[PDB]
Design a protein around this ligand. Structure first.
Ligand SMILES: [Cl-]
Length: 310
C-alpha cells in the first residue's frame, strides 16, 4: 500500500562487528506489508528490557558495542531499525515519513512484543521520538539512558531546542546540507566526517543499507522534520515535557558527547533540568554526536549507576 523497497541481503554479508541474528515483523497494525528488522539479544525471559533507538542516518549497527555489555548484565536487548533504515523496509516517497508514522511504529512494536520494565536508550532521532513514548503507557517504562537528544517542541516554549538549527553554520546547518543536497549521497563518507574515529570497515556498514538513492528517502526526510515541525510533533513534544517534569519517577543516566556541534552542552543541560531526578551528566570529552562510538564506556557506566540503586 505504501510503496516500499527492501535492501538486498548480500549488502550485509561483510559487516564488521555485527554478529547478531535478524528478527523481523511484518504484521504491525497500521503498517501493512512492511517488514521491520530488529535485534533481540540476551535472555528473552529477562526481567529488564533495554530498548535501543537509533537516529539519523544510522541503524541498530550503531549500538553494536553497547548490546553485548547490556546482554552480559542479564538484560534482554531490543534494537529495531526504523522504516527507511538498516534492514527494515524503505518507503520510497519522502511524504510517507512523518513524526507520527515513526512514532506509531514504535508504540506498535512495543505492544506487539509486549515489552515491560524497559530501559529506554536514546540519541538523536531515537530521542526526539523515544522521549514521547512513556507518556502513552507509563507502566512499561522504568529507566532512561539519554545521549545527545532533546524534544522537538516549538521555539517559544524551549528556545534551546530550536536554536541549534540556525547556529552555528558548521553545526546542524552543515549536517542538513550534507544530507538533503547531494544527489549522490555517500553515507560512508558522511559518517567518517561526523564520527572521525570510525574505521573504513565501520564507515561502510553505514552505507550498506543503501545501494543507491532510491533507498534513501527516509534518510533525506529526517533533517527536514527537524527544520519544519508539523503540528502533531509540536503538540506531542510539548505534552512530553510535562510528563518528564511532573510524571516521571524512574532512574536516569545522561551522557553528553562534548564535541557535538548539534546537541551538546547547551542543548543537554536544559534537557537535564526538565527530567525529574536526572543526575549530573557524564561528560565525554572526546566524543562527538555519535556518543555510541564511545559506547562501551557509556554502557558500563550506566549499568554501574543503575546497580547502585537495586
Ligand atoms: Cl536529522
Amino acid at each position: 500500500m505504501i510503496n516500499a523497497i527492501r535492501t538486498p541481503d548480500q549488502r550485509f554479508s561483510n559487516l564488521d562487528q555485527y554478529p547478531f541474528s535478524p528478527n523481523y515483523l511484518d504484521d504491525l497494525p497500521g503498517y501493512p506489508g512492511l517488514r521491520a528488522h530488529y535485534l533481540d539479544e540476551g535472555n528473552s525471559d529477562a526481567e529488564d528490557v533495554f530498548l535501543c533507538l537509533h537516529g539519523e542516518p544510522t541503524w541498530s549497527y550503531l549500538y553494536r558495542k553497547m548490546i553485548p555489555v547490556f546482554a552480559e548484565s542479564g538484560a534482554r536487548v531490543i534494537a529495531p531499525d526504523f522504516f527507511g533504515f538498516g534492514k527494515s523496509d524503505k518507503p520510497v516517497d519522502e511524504e510517507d515519513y512523518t513524526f507520527e508514522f515513526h512514532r506509531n511504529f514504535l508504540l506498535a512494536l512495543i505492544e506487539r512484543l509486549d515489552l515491560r520494565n524497559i530501559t529506554l536508550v536514546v540519541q538523536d532521532w531515537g530521542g526526539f521520538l523515544g522521549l514521547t513514548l512513556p507518556m502513552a503507557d507509563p507502566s512499561r517504562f522504568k529507566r532512561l539512558i539519554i545521549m545527545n537528544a532533546c524534544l522537538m517542541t516549538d521555539p517559544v516554549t524551549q528556545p534551546a531546542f530550536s536554536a541549534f538549527v540556525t547556529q552555528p553554520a558548521d553545526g546542524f546547518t552543515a549536517w542538513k546540507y550534507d544530507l538533503v543536497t547531494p544527489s549522490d549521497l555517500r553515507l560512508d563518507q558522511f559518517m567518517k566526517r561526523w564520527a572521525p574515529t570510525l574505521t573504513e570497515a565501520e564507515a561502510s556498514a553505514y552505507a550498506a543499507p543503501f545501494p543507491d538513492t532510491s533507498y534513501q528517502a527516509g534518510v533525506r526526510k529526517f533533517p527536514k522534520m527537524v527544520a519544519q515541525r508539523d503540528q502533531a510533533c509540536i503538540d506531542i513534544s510539548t505534552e512530553a515535557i510535562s510528563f518528564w517534569q511532573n510524571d516521571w519517577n524512574g532512574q536516569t543516566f545522561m551522557a553528553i558527547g562534548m564535541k557535538d556541534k548539534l546537541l551538546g552542552p547547551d542543548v543537554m543541560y536544559p534537557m537535564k533540568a526538565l527530567i525529574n531526578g536526572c543526575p549530573e551528566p557524564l561528560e565525554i570529552a572526546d566524543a562527538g554526536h555519535f556518543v555510541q562510538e564511545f559506547g562501551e564506556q557509556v554502557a558500563r557506566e550506566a549499568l554501574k549507576h543503575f546497580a547502585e540503586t537495586e
